[PDB]
């Protein structure tokens, strides 16, 4: 048996995530014109983080199926929790930064290439990884579990008990910033695109006779809101659900390959290079 | 035996120094904006070039100039040294943010061929993305020409008699309704060519300028803001 | 004066190059085929190049 | 009298047409089926050359088949290494608008030129160790379309004002000027024996030029529109050109007419750059449909594609030994194929 | 070889009528956007009317808009322009101007130089 209703989901998630991330790294490391963009570097680090969380999420499937044990869940539980939580934090803050990037592109369009120095970009990437690790340090300081990610183990749910103060800290300094940033940037960019479409259609009226960031962030945050709301709910009064906790956490995990299937079905700057590379590698 | 390795080392530091220079000059090259000025010889393109030259200098072949508005580097290319044909050297202007088109509005016949030059610019395969900024110089001259009389725009343009002004900023330049009817007929005559085609990639941005004008540099500033916002939205892929 | 003399020298030169040596198209095609088949083995892009002749790959 | 000159011109053009009619009695596809094909030519990007910012208009190889220069519209003239992908020099130009670039057969000199109407010459091998400009060639009015080095002290410069001109660098002045064209002579290739060079113009007249005599030997008109690129089939007795007619064809100097044309129904855009492989079997053609193409030069059927750029292919230069081919394009990337 | 043979002309009285003919050879004639250019003596060379590839899209100079009618036979390989109500000022030399390029709408046929794809000349006076 060995949790037959979950293991198919787990293994399909692992293989899908690592496959899509290997494909997108191939695209962004082969295509020369695709490389020279700031958002391209941001998507590259998204691919790096997503590939790491995909390869790291193999070991719960191994423990489910072949049952290995370096340490008997006493430390590898929160090791896996810290790893998955930091990598999802990295992907979330990366989406926040790419939203800031093309908000700067739309709002300040002339001084755009003056503002985003690749020095500033690489410093931003380092700040994303350092910050994502540095928020989750009270997990190491024995105060609280970072979240219900990595509770597939039977020991973790019955031993760990989250702290309201620490999860309040991580909500009001990690997830609410990313949500407010993405909402603000898409609100202003949508307003500007609205008035531009209005002017275009107006001039076409006097003379007669979706968005990739919006789609990606909307999918990411539709898949992320159940986890964050039910996570803060389960730490609000110590409420206890099993099916909701597991399904919401792995739903949040599914973001990492959905980011690549968006580019696989749209945004022909990705599809053209993928088809070119597949035709070159096949023959 | 070892001099191959020494040459590999020295060549490697040479390549690193060259790439340091190239990543300096990438910022230098993207910090500035290219504007292909084009237009008829009687059209006062050189006058506005002198105006934004005062507000470096061309020597031979191309009469370049540089000007700055709010610390944004605008460097624009008056191609005047070459011959009367222009089909081949204009393919060299796709990195240009926007073509600037200057028109002597007063001289009719010298206006139909301006319309044909716009129609050739718009439908060129390598200028399909490039968005014309259109200037209409000699505003006071056209005002006098259709205010004094005896120079009938209806003769050189047969649809002006039936034409009426749709909506316009009349009262402050409101010397007469006929001058405003004529000038908006002319900009609509350009804009009908403008909006006849295009997949949203390029748009005409018409303006009116007389002889003595200073704020046309800020006009190019605001225009280029709008063109680069549009193409950044297009790279953002929302339609 | 000068233009008429230039036109006269032009039509004289075209008259001179009217009677130039003429070979038929068959011999010209044979010349191209001879040059192609003569230098056949030395062509690196035509032939499948073994990797030993560019061995730093 | 004018009518006597008109009837002499009538006799001349009837002589030309009758010579074309009686001379044409064969077709290369028709007389010999014994040609063997080339088949598939799969060319992969061995190495990608990524320094340029703006679009690339011309590249030219060295004699050693290792060094190659390429000039681009940001104002840089980079000498590349086709082995280590290393930039030996990157010369910043005075004028950004540079439509041509030529690298000396000796290897010491490289030239730029374009809309600024100066054909500047850059010396590389110097005791100081810094690249400088040798002299500025200013004898042209229209834009400089293509230039080709004869030796260290002679260069021929084609321009946009019908004038391809032979020069002399250390004098600072022209030596000869060839004026027979009608408008916009674009690309010119030198004969292997270096005594001749041909040059195609917008008139669709590709005119041979004799360097020693100074006048046009033969004129070739078989294209329907303006000509963008010309070459030499390396025998020197034949040459093929590609134009904005969306077709390309080969003329023979002795046959002095059209010989074989390479076109297809699907291709609806004109050649920007063309070049010949070393044995002259593989005609290699850039295009405006964002990819190159590869043509058999005899059987007249294409045999390979070099789709690695997503902009029009403006540059295509084979090596002297055949060990490569490098196509530049407007996406500021140079790619060496094999 | 590019060939543009023109015929039809002679003096006409004002308010008359005449036909223009432009025989072409050497290229696919159903492919290009031809024109009609004229030069009244003492003045520059000016474009009159344009016909696109199938023939549907037609534009006219704002002087000869009502009078002249332009049409072509791509099978018979000829451009035409029919004159009605000729003003005294329509005396000029008339050239049919073919585009530099096929498969496109942009076309630079006005130039004062020896433009290659423009006819030798037929004479129409009044």
Author numbering:
A (entry chain R): 26 to 234, 251 to 324
B (entry chain A): 9 to 63, 201 to 254, 265 to 394
C (entry chain G): 6 to 62
D (entry chain B): 3 to 340
E (entry chain N): 1 to 126
Sentences from the paper on this structure:
GPR21 is a class-A orphan G protein-coupled receptor (GPCR) and a potential therapeutic target for type 2 diabetes and other metabolic disorders. This receptor shows high basal activity in coupling to multiple G proteins in the absence of any known endogenous agonist or synthetic ligand. Here, we present the structures of ligand-free human GPR21 bound to heterotrimeric miniGs and miniG15 proteins, respectively. We identified an agonist-like motif in extracellular loop 2 (ECL2) that occupies the orthosteric pocket and promotes receptor activation.
To improve the low surface expression of the wild type GPR21 protein, we used a fusion approach, with thermostabilized apocytochrome b562RIL (BRIL) attached to the receptor N terminus (Wild type GPR21 with BRIL, GPR21(wt)). The stable GPR21(wt)-G protein complex was formed by mixing purified GPR21(wt) with the mini-Gα (mGα), Gβγ and the camelid antibody Nb3518 in vitro. Size-exclusion chromatography (SEC) and SDS-PAGE analysis reveal that purified GPR21(wt) protein can form a monodispersed complex with mGs or mG15 in the absence of an agonist. We finally determined the cryo-EM structures of GPR21(wt)-mGs and GPR21(wt)-mG15 complexes with nominal global maps at 3.3 Å and 3.8 Å resolution, respectively. Some side chains were trimmed in the two models during model building since the map-model correspondence would be incomplete at some regions owing to the relatively low resolution. The overall structures of this mutant (GPR21(m5)-G protein) complexes largely overlap with those of the GPR21(wt)-G protein complexes with the receptor conformation nearly identical (root-mean-square deviation (r.m.s.d) between GPR21(m5) and GPR21(wt): 0.68 Å for Gs-bound and 0.90 Å for G15-bound structures). The overall topology of the two types of G protein-bound GPR21 complex structures resemble each other, and the two G protein binding interfaces largely overlap on GPR21. We found the relative positions between GPR21 and G proteins were similar in the two complexes. Both structures share an overall conserved G protein binding interface mainly consisting of the TM3 and TM5–TM7 of GPR21 and the Gα subunit of the G protein heterotrimers.
